[PDB]
Symmetry: C2
Subunit: 348 residues, 2 copies
């Protein structure tokens, strides 16, 4: 009735998006934390909670009572840790990037099948309020046939990205990944994708801009977009269909609050501002026009571990499907095979 | 003195976009109007003012006092008629489509350069209030280095465009020509263009949708777009630079005014609603953020004719250049050279 879990990494990543949520859930249980160079004052409060720390990896992998493991270490270690963990007979969560290659990403899934364990990336952004509100409108079907969805993550940080680097250090890889995952999880695998990826400030630096479109037939297209020189925000989400529209400004504040010492168990944590409630405008069957706000659903990233709990305890379908993980990674990688702008048809 | 002009055609285009404006200017004199099947009902108020009509093209072309001529008849005629007016020694204004092909178009600018007379397409939308409010801002240089501009023309007319026809009959050809033209006139010739042209209802019916990106180097990109199923409007214009943004909602009302029986001499014609003034949000060199509204320049399509006057009576530069006109037609046609989405590379 409780999942015995551990952590491969005690960095800030594991400390800002994982533990503040995991600790508040009586359905979860954190036994061992694994950092090669752990921190005492940060861990001090955790050890006092009964949490066990160690820089001995096998002390965590051989531990027979543990079944789940999250990897929150540097991007380059994610493939081999997930490999080492699957073998130890445990289910694992992998922060981005899942794997260095699509072929490796597939490898792990074949092993999830083999060792009969769960393997998937950490996609917490599926529990963003603004995305959730968009997802709810699309599922009830008010708008009719959806022809287009636009989703952003802009900043006003001109001149922040100025250096060279591998595509893995870019924004498409850093941000697009999240944006496409939740849309791929909603509309499925597209037929083709078009890419405009670049640095609109320093030509030769890693991308800080991208305008990518995932097409579905001739009727629909979902556009994910990022720009670092945006002073006037576009809506966080734009949706258009045959019966109407949905416009949603304002992003999920879980991140801006956690950065201010406000934890997940705190009251009000994850509730959007009514001044930011999404807005629907459609004409019913009677041809009448209707305009109301959509109360943004409460955003909670922990629900990602809630999902893992139902999967591990109630066999409920695993949140991230191999197909969404693999499709996402194929588009990410495909965006760098050709010089932008480019077009690309999914493997079929 | 004033410029003596005539009209090749007396249809609805003439009686709505040209005549209402030309009659109010004293620098202009409509001496002759030509048409195979004139309308005595509508010719009365004109004939009475001093305008002569005729069903004989020679009379109009042979007249040596007429220096300017406007072609408003059906599209398929525009080529040979304009060529006839160039030979007859007159300057000509041609409603879109200027010509049936790029090859032909170039020939006209040539013949025009030959006989020594101005030749150019009537591009009135360069005088739309919101386009002007955007142009004014880009020229003053508030926002520093502009990295993107998004210009629209949407409608909520689902289920209207349902049939096949030549490309000239689609949205990109009837609406994209106006959006792009005024952007080419401002930023010049792009390096490449990407196309997403289609119909999101009946894939094979003439296109009722388009997302076209005009690329300028690695820093700037102008996106022209249209969609017939948009209930919640996008901004009419969107601009982002190094120093700030400019968002402009609301379109020019000169048409809904003319289509409402309000003439160009009516009080407050072409004046934008204060609730629609575009708004800038930029930061000066002191780091100070400034957010103010921009009074929309008054909309007046008659200004196209004022420009033509400064070119004919004062030797001023002509509004629509051979480059602007020809490039617009190159990109328009180049979009249907291959299946969408596609990427295109310009010359020169």
């Amino acid at each position: 009735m409780t999942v015995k879990m551990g952590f491969i990494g005690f960095g800030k990543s594991a400390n800002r998006y994982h533990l503040p949520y995991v600790m508040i859930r009586e359905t979860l249980e954190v036994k061992t934390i694994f950092d090669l160079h752990v921190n005492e004052k940060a861990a001090a409060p955790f050890k006092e909670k009964g949490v066990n720390f160690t820089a001995d990896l096998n002390e965590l992998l051989t531990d027979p009572e543990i079944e789940l493991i999250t990897i929150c270490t540097p991007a380059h270690t994610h493939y081999d840790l997930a490999k080492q963990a699957i073998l130890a007979g445990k289910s694992v969560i992998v922060e981005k990037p899942f794997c260095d290659t699509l072929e490796h990403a597939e490898e792990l899934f074949a092993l999830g099948q083999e060792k009969g364990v769960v393997v998937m990336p950490y996609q917490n952004r599926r529990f963003d309020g603004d995305y959730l509100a968009m997802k709810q409108v699309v599922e009830q079907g008010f708008l009719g046939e959806i022809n287009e969805v636009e989703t952003h993550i802009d900043y006003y940080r001109p001149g922040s990205i100025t250096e060279q680097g591998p595509k893995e250090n870019g924004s498409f890889y850093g941000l697009g990944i999240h944006l496409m995952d939740r849309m791929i999880a909603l509309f499925g695998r597209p037929d083709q994708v078009t890419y405009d990826i670049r640095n609109n400030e320093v030509s030769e630096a890693v991308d800080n801009y991208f305008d990518v479109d995932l097409h579905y037939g001739s009727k629909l297209k979902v556009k994910v977009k990022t720009n670092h020189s945006v002073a006037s925000p576009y809506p966080r989400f734009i949706v258009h269909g045959s019966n109407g529209s949905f416009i949603k400004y304002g992003e999920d504040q879980q991140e801006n609050d956690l950065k201010a010492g406000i934890m997940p168990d705190a009251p009000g944590f994850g509730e959007d501002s009514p001044m930011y409630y999404g807005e629907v405008t459609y004409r019913n069957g009677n041809g009448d026009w209707i305009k109301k706000q959509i109360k943004t659903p409460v955003g909670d990233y922990g629900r990602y571990y809630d999902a893992v709990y139902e999967t591990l305890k109630n066999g409920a379908p695993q949140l991230v499907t191999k197909e969404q993980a693999l499709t996402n990674i194929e588009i990410l990688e495909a965006g760098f095979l050709n010089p932008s702008p480019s077009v690309y048809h999914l493997k079929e």
